[PDB]
Write a protein that binds this ligand. Structure first.
Ligand SMILES: [Cl-]
Ligand SMILES: [Cl-]
Ligand SMILES: [Cl-]
Ligand SMILES: [Cl-]
Ligand SMILES: [Cl-]
Ligand SMILES: [Cl-]
Ligand SMILES: [Cl-]
Ligand SMILES: [Cl-]
Ligand SMILES: [Cl-]
Ligand SMILES: [Cl-]
Lengths: 130, 118, 128, 128, 129, 129, 119, 130, 128, 130
């Protein structure tokens, strides 16, 4: 199609970016598809999991959407029209894992028109001593 | 109103024997958006060799210690007239009456089978 | 960019607009979204109820669409695209209630790329 | 939406139109919707039922499409775009019922944009 | 394939619906066509006239849009696509005429793939006490 | 239609905001229309005029785009599709006029589907010490 | 309303001399759908060396023995702020005042004159 | 685009198909374009001309639409949307020319989306003696 | 009215087009329909096969998408609208087979308003 | 959001691909924009030129569309919507030039919501065999 690739933005929004501290992460996914009617899912790297106090576009996640022991957040019927669609997953009050770089992925897995249907983005968790 | 049919389809209906169960849910109206959910009674479980409308269950569709099977209603599933869950090669539990349930979580139905004494 | 708002029109289409007389009321709803799939719902004020002789887009309401003692009418799998979608709820052969102003609501509860805020509209029933 | 009402044509296409003789019936439904992604069903009147040798747009009906003891034929995901869609159900090698008028119905029951989503058409089975 | 019909809604939106009082009237027209480019026209019944304090889609009418002594309001280069086009004429702070039912019309006079037949809608002005 | 109102942003983007000093002004218009194929015009208030060193989306204005003695800048065929269109008029190297508030306007004047086709925005020009 | 400007733009304004004329129609509104039409008085004619907004006239655009120039308003023309007809390298006719007309013919008129000088 | 080629159907609808007799011709042109906003024109072969008693979609031709000595009938802004458009030119009460095969053409000359933007179709005018 | 047809392009995009050398092949398929939802399928000629290092629209193929011993590649839930849909199958770092002409196929097996007939395209592998 | 890019394919469609033989070449261009209206232009490499026997979307080129001594072919009022527009320039019955690789370009010079960057594609003309 006439639109660009799917995009994903990942950022630590909480005050702390340090390993083993409480913080918040926001993952903003834009399919950038002419049309989508299909499955969309976020895959979280080891160190991060979703639960029902996390939100998608401001609404609490439902257990039916959280799969693979908190690693997968799936929307079975995910709308997009001319790249207007957006899925913002907020991971609230998480204990950040060990220092290092962590990569998140989001993908439209079915029923989408576009040139590339997945995207990845990373965050850096900082060391306790610098 | 929705219907659920539950049948032991293997040759044997007797406690602790090897058999097959078939659970056929029919909403009889159209499904709305949501997640089709079967509940099996304690003594029955599903695994990834069982099937839903001819397709192997995925691990993500089974939880609650094997007693719950979920099928989120993607656009291509919404219009189905029927959801047929085949529980294959099971060891039947102790004699008694067992009630199976199915609903569209966002159209409740239930049915029972009788497992025979040896 | 910024998205538009839903609209609702509430129209007494029968010849009479007078209290305690027979008439028809038509409620025209446009959720006015880029794309929506799922539940849309009309809410009727006290004085008006829906039954299976009333219609949605020309077709008789089903029992399962009529909730909360006739005050709620649901379209469970509505579709909207570019604001072209439209739902016409026609309340047929109703005895209009006491003179006054009556407000109807229609709301978008679907999967939606759009502004889901409800729309309202009113009719005036005239005194005998 | 900008299109007209759904339409249904119903015709006895076999050489005989006489009660208790073999013939074929063709039912041509046009949803006339801006977009459809939902369920479409034909409803057959008493005296006519469908089986897996009958066809939808030339393809044999699947068992999963035939509901309510053969009275209902469903396309569970029935596409339309600006009224380009069409569903032609052919009831083949049927023994016509008693003489009289028989009314068929077809409708989009979900996920469709349009002003009227059902249509009816009838056939006359001749005496003798 | 058959095409749909245009729609017009006419509403007294101000608090008062009584003859010889001030109120506002809104006219919402959807030509409801696959594709239209060109002239669309509202026609107001005697008792109601347009001026440059009235608005089309939130913007003041130009003198050139008001014809036939305030009876006709034209959108010379309207556009419609898939029935998504909409024109809202708002008659601001008008003195309502004598009690009765008044019928407004809107017509599609454009290049069009669609049903160009006019739409109509009425309002009821109530009697003084 | 399903989009919101047209928007206009107006900002003095040069270093100076002071009356009678050199600066640049940037006017960003979003028609926010389902589809536009028509005329779009910026209207500049007294104190500002356009010439061919000014730009529309980075391109020098053509003489035929500048009307009404520099007061009006036209895009004669101004595309929009689902609000993706944008028109950025940059007024380059201008002498700001006397201190006060100045209001700019932009509008789709024809062949557009939308709910509100014009927008205004202002800038404040500061007094010299 | 709509205006028309008629001006002799070449060196000479005198009967029988070679010069240039500019006819500039400015709707002060926008154009409506229709046909842009210029009417030249006897003594002036258009040909395919003349131009409308910088484009050479086409044969189908000129009729009435070169005295009428007609441009049906296709979508790409509608938005124009002006229609400028350039009559290039012409022989000015006998001395007198000559009136040009231009209008947008629609299914829903302007004038200007030049003085050609006696030699 | 996803639609087929422009089509043109040409037929003598009058009772007589014979050379030098009065008859009527109907030319039905379908651009079959996803979208058109451009110029559309019919081209008539020598032997046939248009005038203002002829009609386009039931409306009298205007003199501004008839060009090249009655051989060209042009619409400057010709709409189509997903192939729903049609231009039916009725040539009314013409004197059929000499016996032979005559080919008509219609085309979209600008601002159209599609795979083929012109079509041709012929009619046969019969001999007075057979 | 009448519909258009699908298109397939097949291109050697690697540096070499020579038999027995390493290269990349890209197949660009447009089913070119008004609306489609469902299975689309590419078929590769003897000499070329797909594995999970090859990609569809930039994403590695899944084992379940590769069938018939590497000869068939399926997109099970493709979507098309107004001929805007496109599928790009890239065969990465393949050893080109013997000099000659090789023909690829792509077919629409979906629910479709449109011409489902397959599209073909060929590449020429050059002699050393 | 972000936009996609235009595509060009170049295909020798005649039976022969060998230098100095007669063949046909077809260039398929998709500007791939949300909305475009105006000029699109093809550029042919040395060894190929256009004339009025070549076609665009199956219709003979006009002299006014062929510029720079046959090197440039313009569509002056192209239309694109949602990446559905497509232009096919067919070079008919050409004598193929010397064996080698030949690169064609197509560019969007229109009013556009879209990425107007040019697209390129090449063909290989084969050596004659011995
Ligand atoms: Cl896309
Ligand atoms: Cl519709
Ligand atoms: Cl809009
Ligand atoms: Cl011409
Ligand atoms: Cl003279
Ligand atoms: Cl097309
Ligand atoms: Cl006629
Ligand atoms: Cl895999
Ligand atoms: Cl392509
Ligand atoms: Cl030749």
């Amino acid at each position: 199609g006439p639109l660009g690739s799917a995009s994903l933005f990942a950022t630590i929004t909480g005050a702390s970016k340090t390993e083993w501290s409480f913080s918040d992460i926001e993952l903003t996914y834009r399919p950038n598809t002419l049309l989508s009617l299909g499955v969309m899912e976020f895959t979280l790297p080891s160190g991060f999991t979703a639960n029902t106090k996390d939100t998608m576009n401001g609404n609490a996640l439902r257990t039916t959407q959280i799969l693979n022991n908190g690693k997968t957040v799936r929307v079975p019927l995910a709308l997009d029209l001319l790249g207007a669609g957006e899925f913002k997953l907020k991971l609230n009050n998480k204990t950040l894992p060990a220092a290092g770089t962590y990569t998140f992925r989001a993908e439209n897995k079915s029923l989408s028109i576009g040139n590339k249907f997945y995207a990845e983005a990373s965050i850096d968790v900082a060391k306790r001593s610098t």
